[PDB]
Design a protein around this ligand. Structure first.
Ligand SMILES: C[C@@H](O)c1ccc2c(c1)N(CCCN(C)C)c1ccccc1S2
Length: 182
């Protein structure tokens, strides 16, 4: 079925991230880790990919975001740029939504789309339909209501799950993103 056990890919993880031993949780650290500058690693924001690659088909996973003031979630092309600054944009191979400033939910269209959520999500579901060209986000706290769906996505090659537990801010947003057991 579509549900997939996601694990995080340590080789992609920005040095400001701390991954759990089981690679099912990620949080912001208070200082940068000393780790390699390999080509796969995101170097400018606290971002990490799932290890799994999606070439086709339907895939679903859930993430716990309880109480965090910021986070970003979704899917991206494996071929996205890893080094440097960029726009988390569905014009650049990212299909993402995010929260920042405790209450500002946005979809990563270009320009960005403000999202009005009646029930702040504590868990988010991400449904990828490769052949349908869609990435859809569901509010598990609100009986699975639709947060946002990207459609007409140009998918070529493998996609990857995408995560950020926040940006660097001073160490306030310290709780992890946790991949829910399915
Ligand atoms: C504009 C778009 O390209 C972009 C790129 C990288 C990131 C974000 C947005 N934001 C939202 C803006 C935050 N900023 C004002 C300090 C994030 C939200 C949650 C976790 C990480 C991030 S990093």
């Amino acid at each position: 079925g579509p549900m997939v056990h996601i694990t995080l890919d340590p080789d992609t993880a920005n040095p400001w991230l701390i991954l759990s031993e089981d690679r099912r949780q990620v949080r912001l650290g208070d200082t940068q880790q000393s780790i390699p500058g390999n080509e796969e690693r995101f170097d400018s924001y606290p971002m990490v990919l799932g290890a799994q690659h999606f070439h086709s088909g339907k895939h679903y996973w859930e993430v716990d975001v309880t109480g965090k003031e910021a986070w970003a979630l979704g899917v991206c092309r494996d071929s996205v740029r890893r080094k440097g600054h960029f726009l988390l944009s569905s014009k650049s191979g990212f299909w993402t939504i995010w929260l920042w400033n405790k209450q500002k939910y946005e979809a990563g269209t270009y320009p960005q789309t403000p999202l009005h959520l009646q029930v702040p999500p504590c868990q988010v579901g991400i449904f990828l339909d490769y052949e349908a060209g869609m990435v859809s986000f569901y509010n598990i706290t609100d009986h699975g209501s639709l947060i946002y769906s990207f459609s007409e996505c140009a998918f070529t090659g493998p996609l990857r799950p995408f995560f950020s537990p926040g940006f660097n801010d001073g160490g306030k947003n310290t709780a992890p993103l946790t991949l829910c057991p399915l």
